[PDB]
Design a protein around this ligand. Structure first.
Ligand SMILES: Nc1nc2c(ncn2C2OC(COP(=O)(O)OP(=O)(O)OP(=O)(O)O)C(OP(=O)(O)OP(=O)(O)O)C2O)c(=O)[nH]1
Ligand SMILES: Nc1nc2c(ncn2[C@@H]2OC(COP(=O)(O)OP(=O)(O)OP(=O)(O)O)C(OP(=O)(O)OP(=O)(O)O)C2O)c(=O)[nH]1
Ligand SMILES: Nc1nc2c(ncn2[C@@H]2OC(COP(=O)(O)OP(=O)(O)OP(=O)(O)O)C(OP(=O)(O)OP(=O)(O)O)[C@H]2O)c(=O)[nH]1
Ligand SMILES: Nc1nc2c(ncn2[C@@H]2OC(COP(=O)(O)OP(=O)(O)OP(=O)(O)O)C(OP(=O)(O)OP(=O)(O)O)[C@H]2O)c(=O)[nH]1
Ligand SMILES: Nc1nc2c(ncn2[C@@H]2OC(COP(=O)(O)OP(=O)(O)OP(=O)(O)O)[C@H](OP(=O)(O)OP(=O)(O)O)[C@H]2O)c(=O)[nH]1
Ligand SMILES: Nc1nc2c(ncn2[C@H]2OC(COP(=O)(O)OP(=O)(O)OP(=O)(O)O)[C@@H](OP(=O)(O)OP(=O)(O)O)C2O)c(=O)[nH]1
Lengths: 188, 191, 192, 190
């Protein structure tokens, strides 16, 4: 299976560079103190097994899984739902990649209960031969959404429970709105 | 402060080592692939400013701030409260260090609402002199408690000044219930 | 002095980024599994101390310290001198920055015998406040040159000033070193 | 297959941990106001291919490869040959592992020209199952040795005249090392 691992080399690289780039955004507020809209950033390559599986599901020819948009992904975590908008601004203003696609599951959460902002970028990768472009999916979401989705994604490992899970999601969504509301201590 | 810097180097070394060690557990659960009892591992050394400040408001003579327990600290993050217990039992079993204090604020949350399991270890550090020991506070919490704690902590960090506080209190309670509901949903899927 | 670390934020950032970008070049050879022209890659942000010194020397006003070429630097270590050309061409082809200066102290060694290939680049750091370009110096060396340069530098960190019997020579050291590389290149040549 | 991926997990972990432990040693000198005996530190685990070919060469029966001493290896580089003694002491004085073997190829340098000090330690990895011990081979060398060792290791790709030029290249490096420390001595007298 060296075949695919050789294929994923530029995806690994793309992710590592984007980790350093985005993890450093936060670092900019670190010497003006303030409040940073970014709490932390994670990154990952879809494991080969998952890549072939999803390509069948959405019926993609092995010759064109490049068009699969989340072989490489990064995840940005914020405190408040209004930070997501701010982070959006940045990623759009950036010109070391270019935004290609977007899916707002914060406005219209999924039937599962799932909430996140997904923006797919086109990352220009420098290689020994020339210049490749790989699709990276960045996912922006609050800690609350991240709490919900991390547990739900795991359960991967019954209809009564799909419902309780959807209930839990919105419970969590209210706890979001409540902290943002609480943030009205700005009255100082 | 070049003097301070020499004081904090062992603590930084201690965070870095434990960081790598504890991500060993996560790393290991990726193979034998069930859900890892550790989601994230972070670590920080207290900034000199906060070291002096925490010192002031607890007496602690500036020649005895080695007794301050959280100069070095790691935070461990778990999906489930069940996962915390596993992580707790792993730490007590380790030979690379020694537990010397624990404060269970999951059982009895603080007045502010804060929940977390706090474990204090004595970490041995090889040096150029001989062998140094340092106190490192390991904090364990769920994604849900981590959500509350991060947000409440930041708000407090702007000075800290009423009815807001009681809403924060209830907020912790909501999160606890979300935690409980997810545990129930878990054993429900056993079936 | 808290002004300095805020000043240096974009410098470490840029260094961190080129570090990951360059190590990736190496990585593109553990799969190809042939010879990689890059063995190691390091980076530094000049200490405030060194920055201040270098400012007076080069005659750089402190409010335009930005014009200093190596506040941020990276260093790439190669096996053979020929590897240095392969990396030079690679760097010149990259479009995530642009080359603005080069100094070939390999062909024309410095007085004290220091050898290396320096190229200075203009790096496009994205930030919240828009963009920003930083001058980053990339040094390129063989292991052999690296050996000499490291040691000489550590010595030159004794009062700066230094005897002329230790000055009987490290150039001779450096010429010896230069000949080792010469030899190693030749030896390699024997492939048959 | 995956029975290997599982085998190497304690080795990759022990490497990651020692990497952090040893890199930290130089950091003790960033405010020591002295010179650090460690310049840098590298780490690797042996890729399965390499592991197999070695055991099917040194004639090691598979079912006990965990006797093979360098499945996990770190490597310490120094400026001077005097540093190597110093680091060596530290390593011996450490309590987070025990030294169990040693090969001084600086003292007695191998037909090829190979010079470096090899230290073998038993590392007590805390695992979930308990406490595993794993053999890790630490290699200490000067930059000079490293320049030579690195190039020669890669020439993996033979003429008896070439083997000899290489031998003399090792010597050349060794002298240049000695000249360096010599130069270093004269510097101290000032
Ligand atoms: N502030 C904050 N950070 C969190 C939190 N949870 C996780 N992190 C961090 O997540 C990081 C990176 O994501 P991780 O998924 O845990 O994976 P990593 O093992 O760090 O691999 P990666 O670095 O991304 O290749 C961090 O540090 P770095 O990678 O930057 O360095 P450091 O790792 O030294 O802490 C974090 O501090 C959190 O609740 N709050
Ligand atoms: N070891 C060694 N290095 C040398 C020698 N000559 C020049 N260099 C270095 O070159 C560096 C970077 O490029 P420049 O100094 O700008 O190149 P030059 O234009 O030739 O120097 P110049 O501007 O004329 O003084 C160094 O880093 P810095 O010292 O500035 O910062 P650090 O110690 O952090 O590495 C050097 O130490 C030498 O004889 N021996
Ligand atoms: N967000 C939040 N965090 C809390 C709360 N209560 C305690 N913690 C934390 O507990 C810490 C460790 O304290 P412990 O010594 O384990 O227990 P305590 O006795 O309750 O603290 P104490 O000794 O009284 O100060 C922290 O680090 P430090 O603040 O000291 O340093 P940092 O800013 O790095 O987080 C906390 O922020 C709380 O009500 N909300
Ligand atoms: N460049 C170079 N390196 C040498 C030479 N001789 C030995 N070494 C190395 O020594 C290694 C480990 O040391 P030991 O096994 O303890 O010493 P020995 O008993 O002499 O080797 P042996 O057991 O006979 O094979 C290596 O790793 P491995 O090769 O096994 O794998 P890799 O380089 O990928 O790590 C070496 O390459 C040499 O003549 N030139
Ligand atoms: N926890 C959770 N995550 C969800 C849910 N719905 C979608 N996501 C995720 O969305 C992913 C990628 O986003 P998109 O492809 O842009 O959005 P969609 O088109 O809706 O996905 P889709 O085509 O339906 O699969 C994920 O990574 P992958 O699963 O593909 O791989 P991994 O989790 O390992 O990263 C998700 O897990 C959900 O209901 N719960
Ligand atoms: N301080 C110093 N470092 C040197 C010198 N020559 C080479 N190095 C190296 O410095 C490295 C980095 O040191 P680190 O402490 O690991 O810091 P980093 O730059 O962030 O690397 P890191 O990624 O953390 O390992 C190397 O990475 P690796 O490829 O080994 O691992 P690696 O691939 O891991 O880089 C080196 O080979 C020198 O004269 N002085």
């Amino acid at each position: 299976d060296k075949q695919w691992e050789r294929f994923l080399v530029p995806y690994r690289q793309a992710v590592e560079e984007l980790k350093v780039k985005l993890k450093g955004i936060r670092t900019l507020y670190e010497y003006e103190d303030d409040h940073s809209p970014i709490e932390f950033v994670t990154g990952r390559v879809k494991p080969v097994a998952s890549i072939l599986e999803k390509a069948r599901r959405k019926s993609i020819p092995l010759h064109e899984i490049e068009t699969m948009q989340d072989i490489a992904g990064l995840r940005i975590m914020c405190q408040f739902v209004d930070d997501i908008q701010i982070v959006k601004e940045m990623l759009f203003a950036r010109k070391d990649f270019t935004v290609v696609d977007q899916r707002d599951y914060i406005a219209e959460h999924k039937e599962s209960g799932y909430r996140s902002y997904h923006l797919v970028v086109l990352y220009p990768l420098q290689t020994v031969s020339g210049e490749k472009h790989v699709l990276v999916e960045i996912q922006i979401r609050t800690l609350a959404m991240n709490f919900w989705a991390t547990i739900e994604h795991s359960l991967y490992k019954p209809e009564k429970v799909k419902l309780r899970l959807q209930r839990a999601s919105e419970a969590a969504s209210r706890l979001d709105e409540e902290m943002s509301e609480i943030r009205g201590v700005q009255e100082a």
